[PDB]
RNA sequence: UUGAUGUCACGGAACAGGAACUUGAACAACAUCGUUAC
């Protein structure tokens, strides 16, 4: 859990509503550095949460 | 022609059963072709 010099938070993989989300995970997410992804209204984030997306941060277009 | 905080589809052998088989001495003798004459 060390990209270049910063640590990485375990990320959040649990929403509240389930009307969207055509499918859910059944995979047993890989674990490292037991901590908490606490801040929901933050100002800085762990690089994994900058890859997740918490208008768009990183946008993937169609191929 | 997708929408985002959540995709084990490399998560799944086009697989499993059905005799190209059955019947047959490489052997042998009587003709062929039509009209002539009162």
UniProtKB/TrEMBL annotation:
It comes from the Bacteria. Disulfide bonds join 9-46. Zn(2+) 2 binds at residues 46, 49. Zn(2+) 1 binds at residues 9, 38, 46, 49. Zn(2+) 3 binds at residue 49. This is CRISPR-associated RAMP family protein. It comes from Desulfonema ishimotonii. The lineage of its organism: Bacteria, Pseudomonadati, Thermodesulfobacteriota, Desulfobacteria, Desulfobacterales. The chain holds residues 78 to 153 of 1601 of the full protein.
């Amino acid at each position: 859990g060390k990209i270049s010099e910063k640590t990485c938070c375990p990320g959040k993989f649990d929403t509240e509503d389930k009307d969207r989300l055509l499918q859910l995970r059944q995979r047993s997410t890989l674990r490292w550095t037991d901590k908490n992804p606490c801040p929901d209204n933050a100002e800085t984030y762990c690089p994994f949460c900058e890859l997740l997306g918490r208008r768009f941060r990183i946008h993937f277009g169609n191929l």
